[PDB]
Ligand binder design. Structure first.
Ligand SMILES: [Mg+2]
Lengths: 782, 98, 146, 240, 98, 49
């Protein structure tokens, strides 16, 4: 029984790392939500499936269900009732125990088999064994708890709307469950019971607005271990609102279960409009954004083992959900459109109106002439022109070489996309002369392809043949150099094109990571580090002692992030102090500014530090200490001396170091880290178990474990990628990210271009030394 | 290849789905364009390529006073839409040609 | 931007670091080899009881877990083990409850595993003398490195 | 979302700073401890791994170039072969590091043969630059794919930087160092070990000046002292 | 045979083409390397072989006349059916030469 | 060599294989594995013949 005391004390020592914040009023409701989740999971098999939540006048909450009661048997190996085991024991490594520990009084009533049972807990310590009080004829379970006033400060009163919203959402998602919310302080009641499900969810949202068609699209299927439910409707607004869920957990950033929805909608609407001839009668072409105006939809999925980007959910990265949603949507939306013609007519009318409204926001663009089989029109032989003749609906791509050119040509859209290859690094027009620029070949080819003229005499910016120019180079540094050269050319020679906004930049990926059946694309090194951290912590739990519930995922992630930031900051300042000494100050007591003019404490502090350093040495170094006396302010500055490789060095810790921000950050991390792990602490990830003695050891073990079966692929250039990958990653208008170039200040831009791309070397060297060598030792730590 | 006839206007076009073995498509298109330019084949107005991820698709349009079958036969006779393959099976047996 | 003296000093510092690291590596390897050799030499003085214990064992895991159950008398290796002064040949990661405590030897799991992988041709006395020669050479090398 | 505005100054600054830092730190400047650019170190390590020793049969250049490109150096193959060729020319290095078989150019301007003709192997002195490599004397880092390990610096017994020199062009800076003689450098190192407080004038008693593979005559003694004292200077070389 | 000796199986990671070409040139084939690379390229194109023997990664050309990328970009590995051609090679079923 | 009459005669390589026997091969479980392999070898020889 003594182990239960250790667990409860461990929970109560640091409540914020198990339930959440304790002053804003978040965990105070999280406890109720956890109890309600347990009740709704249990009571799913009840005869009537009803849940009652009550707020009493004495600031207490009770949750009651009508399912099968908690078993009241006695474990042979424990000698106590199963209810006490559920409410107290950790249930091995890896959610009512925390609530019991953080509440100053909890009452439990279990009635089953025609009997009534009752027990009372005080601070997690039972007062008497479970006893029988009377005979009944029903089944159920009630839990009533008084939140403790020693841990929850500031806001200590429950609200009514916060519970109401979540309960209504749970009633919407779980069809056939009745939830009643009663209040006693003032007196209010509600009853959430909807058998429609997502249809009622869509009706509730699209209530204060004005729908334009009567029927609502809806379906619900299951392909292989995956369930999909979708419902949508159109209103007369100009907004988009899509809500996504995964195992009754909302995601605010979408994921893989939204792209398939969008793509299927676009394909189905475009196919229907093309087949019915509505597009031909008009003189417009629809796009994805026009379709998604005044739309309300809800998407929900059921997956056995979901995978997310972080520990706060908010994004789904499972790779086998997109096709599952898309195939069903494509199959069923056409059938929906075929049965009901009036809604189809109304929707296509609205979409046509929006598309025509977009068209009236352009300029006067005369038609161009495109290179073709029967006419070359005096255009370069390396150009792969498109078929669209309107310059406002055409795009041009610039690539480094022939391999990338072929890879892009094999995976483009021939209707309104063109490719123009280049040859290596291009001339720098900032250091060259006008005649030298004219004598070049690549520049001449680019000028001919653009068809605007040169020299600012016949240069007419109204002759541009493509209203979208996209720069797409490789993902390494040479691509950046070529991008800078092209930007310099465009800014120095054709300012009007940049001013009007006809220049874009593409973002191809650099890495591809695969583990099991999971795949993902990584842009640069920061995303690589984030991915490593995310996959390291998946399915991992930490116990601070032998019998203690595991810490929350968010707190562990925050600790890992802070530790990594501190480690990077320490690594950036290795040139001035030994790294081993800096890494040891985290676990040592903080030396305050007041404890510097008193003496007899600095001596003990430095002696303990030096003894600890000498204890763990494994490289042959020797540590000695000294105390410096200052006659000006009567201070006492510590001195540390070391001998490495037969060389003696001295590192003094002065007054400035104590008051600096680096030591402040180190102490801030230490305050959280000190005294956390007890003696018998263990870590586990999945099934593997490993006892640990330090945070660093556990982190290293997790990192090493997470790397089994991992594959990494690096793309030297665009010629190393398959055409389908390049299309779906960079060239598809539905799933691409680009940037538009603008000018903020002309004087600053001109000065920067002159400094960086000019002929003089000294200003460039000074700029590089100032920006790169310096300004990297950020001493803010805030 | 085949011929499709418009329901309303009555205009007819030729659609090519597959090409013979060891044939370059770009050279075939260039050869057809060169033949049309020098006025050696009559009855062609438009020519373009529309191959995509679905499959090969080459579109040829005829004039108002031409028959599609005659043009198709002329293309068979003059272009690489039909080629000859000569079978000659020679291999080494016991280190000897045979 | 440097001059001659800076380059010379950097080269000297690099040499110092390289030599120190190499010495540490060699010392660790020598200590591990000596630790293995001690256990190998001890087992040859109690051949018959070890053979009987192994034969009566049904599983090699059972033999391994029964080898580290009781202390083994030194016998004829007491003089050999006396030459090792203090903890010169003792690995730094070894707990104090192992090794020679009072006229008796306490084996570990690694040493027990090393015994089970002994060839039948090692019962010749020539290998017995080779063990002593290697032990003395290792002691001399450890002294020089220290 | 799909379209996001960006200022031209930020993009230009970021891209140019990234390129400049990459070029300065990883392509053109040598290290002060071993005097090797990353490509030289990678080539030497790759040759060492294959067991292409100084007293064994030659190996074709194509195999070595392929191994280097496929495992350690993610760049083109022409530059690697050009780098390998220079390390075997007696008129380019004071102490050659690669032993070659075939046509490796000439001082008269002839170019080297293609890599499908020549064969190479390690030189005898090159083994002194990688001594005690397997005894945890240096640190190791990952390759671009994270599947291999590459040494961070060689544990050399030879002051290669002074005896072979260096030359390279970077963004905003450049380097130019002449070669020297081995015995004089060793004597200077011994003198420094003896004193560790010797002045520049004391060191010049053992190292009078540079030494070129093509002999010739150095005209004038000024410039040598200025270069040895500050780091920059100019000298004149005259034919015989 | 060189690809088999390198252990470049059908269910493992890809390898750079330059490494394979270098091994083949340096150990078995006393000829040029461009011809060897061109030979390797043809054995991976789906429009050239009825059953491909090499699995490729990257740009390997098209039927429109596009050329394959340089050998410093692409990666290759053995195909699944290629293991059936070299089955039981280590059980003394064929002869060996120098 | 081999069995002649209630006796076994060894060869040089057979004697060499005996000297390279680990001590863990004297365990009871390790003894029974040889008899299992003998039957499989005999069956394979019969099938090949
Ligand atoms: Mg590149």
């Amino acid at each position: 029984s003594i182990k239960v005391l250790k667990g409860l004390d461990a929970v109560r020592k640091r409540p914020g790392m198990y339930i959440g914040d304790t002053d804003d009023g978040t965990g105070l409701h999280h406890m109720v939500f956890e109890v309600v989740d347990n009740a709704i999971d249990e009571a799913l098999a009840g005869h009537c499936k009803e849940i009652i939540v009550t707020i009493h006048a004495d600031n207490s909450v009770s949750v009651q269900d009508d399912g099968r009661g908690i078993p009241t048997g006695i474990h042979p190996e424990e000698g106590v009732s199963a209810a006490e085991v559920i409410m107290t024991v950790l249930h091995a490594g890896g959610g009512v125990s925390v609530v019991n520990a953080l509440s100053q009084k909890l009452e439990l009533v279990i009635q089953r088999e025609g009997k009534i049972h009752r027990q009372i807990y005080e601070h997690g310590v039972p007062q008497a064994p479970l006893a029988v009080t009377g005979e009944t004829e029903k089944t159920g379970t009630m839990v009533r708890f008084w939140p403790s006033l020693e841990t929850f400060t500031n806001v200590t009163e429950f609200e009514y709307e916060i519970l109401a919203k979540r309960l209504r959402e749970l009633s919407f998602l779980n069809s056939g469950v009745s939830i009643r919310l009663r209040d006693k302080r003032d007196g209010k009641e509600d009853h959430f019971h909807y058998e429609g499900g997502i249809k009622a969810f869509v009706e509730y949202l699209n209530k204060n607005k004005t729908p334009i068609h009567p029927n609502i699209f809806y379906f619900s299927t299951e392909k292989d271990g995956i369930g999909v439910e979708v419902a949508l409707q159109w209103n007369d607004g100009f907004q988009e609102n899509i809500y996504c869920f995964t195992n009754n957990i909302p995601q605010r950033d979408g994921g893989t279960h939204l792209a398939g929805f969008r793509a299927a909608m676009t394909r189905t609407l475009n196919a229907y409009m093309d087949k019915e001839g509505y597009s031909k009668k008009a003189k417009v072409s629809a796009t994805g954004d026009d379709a998604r105006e005044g739309l309300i939809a809800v998407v929900s999925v059921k997956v056995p083992d979901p995978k997310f980007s972080s520990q706060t959910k908010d994004k789904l990265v499972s790779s086998e959900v997109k096709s599952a949603v898309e195939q069903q949507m494509n199959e069923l939306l056409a059938e929906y459109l075929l049965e009901n013609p009036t809604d189809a007519k109304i929707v296509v009318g609205k979409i046509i109106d929006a598309a025509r409204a977009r068209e009236a926001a352009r300029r006067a663009r005369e038609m161009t002439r495109r290179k073709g089989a029967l006419d070359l029109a005096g255009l370069p032989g390396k150009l792969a022109d498109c078929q669209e003749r309107d310059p406002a609906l055409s795009e041009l791509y610039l690539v480094e070489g022939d391999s990338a050119g072929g890879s892009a040509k094999q995976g483009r859209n021939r209707k309104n996309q063109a490719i123009l290859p280049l040859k290596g690094k291009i001339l720098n027009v900032e250091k060259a002369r006008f005649d030298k620029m004219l004598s070049s070949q690549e520049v001449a080819t680019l000028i001919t392809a653009l068809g605007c003229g040169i020299g600012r005499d016949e240069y007419n910016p109204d002759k541009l043949r493509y209203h979208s120019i996209i720069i797409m180079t490789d993902a390494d540094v040479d691509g950046s150099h070529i991008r800078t050269l092209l930007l310099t050319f465009f800014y120095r020679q054709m300012p009007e094109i940049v001013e009007r906004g006809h220049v874009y930049i593409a973002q191809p990926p650099l890495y591809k990571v695969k583990k099991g059946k999971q795949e993902q694309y990584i842009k640069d090194d920061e995303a690589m580090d984030q991915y490593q951290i995310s996959i390291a912590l998946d399915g991992a739990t930490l116990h601070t002692n032998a019998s203690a519930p595991a810490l929350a995922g968010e707190a562990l992630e925050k600790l890992v992030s802070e530790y990594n930031a501190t480690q990077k900051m320490i690594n950036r300042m290795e040139r001035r102090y030994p790294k081993a000494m800096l890494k040891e100050l985290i676990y040592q007591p903080t030396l305050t500014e007041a404890d510097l003019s008193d003496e007899q404490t600095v001596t003990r502090w430095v002696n303990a530090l030096v003894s600890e350093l000498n204890d763990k040495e494994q490289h042959g170094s020797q540590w000695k200490f000294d105390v410096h006396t200052n006659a000006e302010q009567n201070l006492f500055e510590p001195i540390v001396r070391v001998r490495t490789h037969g060389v003696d060095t001295d590192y003094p810790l002065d007054h400035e170091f104590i008051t600096g921000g680096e030591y402040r950050r180190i102490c801030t991390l230490g305050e959280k880290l000190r005294g956390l792990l007890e003696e018998d602490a263990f870590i586990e990830r999945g099934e593997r178990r490993q006892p640990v003695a330090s945070f660093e050891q556990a982190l290293d073990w997790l990192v090493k474990e997470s790397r089994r079966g991992l594959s990494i692929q690096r793309y030297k250039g665009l010629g190393e990628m398959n055409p389908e990958q390049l299309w779906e990653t960079t060239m598809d208008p539905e799933s691409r990210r680009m940037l538009r170039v603008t000018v903020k200040d002309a004087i600053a831009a001109d000065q920067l271009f002159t400094t960086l791309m000019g002929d003089a070397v000294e200003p460039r060297r000074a700029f590089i030394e100032e920006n790169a060598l310096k300004a990297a030792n950020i001493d803010i730590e805030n | 290849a085949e011929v499709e006839v418009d329901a309303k206007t009555g205009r007819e076009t030729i659609i090519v789905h597959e090409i013979p073995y060891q044939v370059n498509k770009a050279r075939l298109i260039e050869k057809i364009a060169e033949l049309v330019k020098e006025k050696r084949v009559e009855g062609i107005s438009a020519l373009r390529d529309e191959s995509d991820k679905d499959g090969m698709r080459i579109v040829i349009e005829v004039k108002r006073d031409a028959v599609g079958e005659v043009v198709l036969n002329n293309l068979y006779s003059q272009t690489q839409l039909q080629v000859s393959f000569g079978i000659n099976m020679v291999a080494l047996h016991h280190g000897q040609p045979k | 931007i440097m001059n001659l003296k800076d380059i010379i000093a950097a080269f000297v510092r690099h040499r110092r670091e390289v030599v120190t690291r190499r010495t540490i590596f060699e010392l660790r390897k020598a200590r591990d080899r000596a630790h293995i050799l001690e256990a190998l030499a001890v087992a040859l003085a109690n051949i018959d009881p070890i053979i009987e214990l192994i034969r009566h064992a049904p599983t090699p895991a059972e033999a391994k877990t029964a080898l580290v159950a009781n202390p083994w008398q030194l016998g004829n290796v007491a003089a050999m083990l006396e030459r090792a002064g203090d903890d010169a040949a003792r690995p730094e990661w070894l707990e104090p409850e192992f090794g020679v405590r009072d006229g008796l030897y306490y084996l570990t799991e690694q040493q027990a595993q090393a015994i089970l992988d002994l060839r039948l041709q090692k019962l010749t006395g020539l290998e017995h003398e080779k063990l002593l020669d290697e032990y003395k050479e290792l002691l001399d090398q450890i002294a020089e490195l220290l | 979302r799909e379209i996001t505005p960006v200022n031209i100054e930020e993009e230009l600054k970021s891209s140019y700073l990234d390129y400049a830092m990459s070029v300065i730190v990883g392509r053109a400047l040598p290290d002060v401890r071993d005097g090797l650019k990353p490509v030289h170190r990678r080539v030497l390590y790759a040759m060492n791994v294959l067991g292409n020793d100084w007293n064994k049969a030659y190996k074709k250049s194509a195999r070595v170039v392929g191994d280097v490109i496929g495992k350690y150096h993610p760049h083109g193959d022409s530059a690697v072969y050009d780098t390998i060729v220079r390390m075997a020319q007696p008129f380019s290095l004071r102490y050659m590091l690669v032993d070659g078989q075939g046509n490796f150019g000439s001082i008269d301007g002839d170019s080297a043969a293609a890599m499908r003709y020549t064969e190479i192997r390690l030189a005898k002195i090159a083994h002194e630059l990688m001594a005690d490599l397997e005894k945890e004397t240096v640190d190791f880092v990952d390759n671009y794919d994270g599947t291999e390990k590459i040494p961070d610096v060689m544990p050399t017994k030879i002051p290669n930087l002074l005896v072979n020199g260096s030359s390279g062009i970077a963004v905003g800076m450049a380097t130019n160092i002449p070669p020297h003689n081995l015995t004089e450098v060793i004597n200077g190192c011994l003198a420094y070990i003896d004193d560790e407080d010797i002045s520049i004038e004391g060191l010049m008693e053992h190292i009078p000046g540079p030494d070129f593979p093509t002999a010739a005559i150095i005209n004038g003694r000024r410039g040598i002292e200025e270069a040895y004292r500050t780091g920059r200077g100019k000298v004149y070389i005259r034919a015989r």
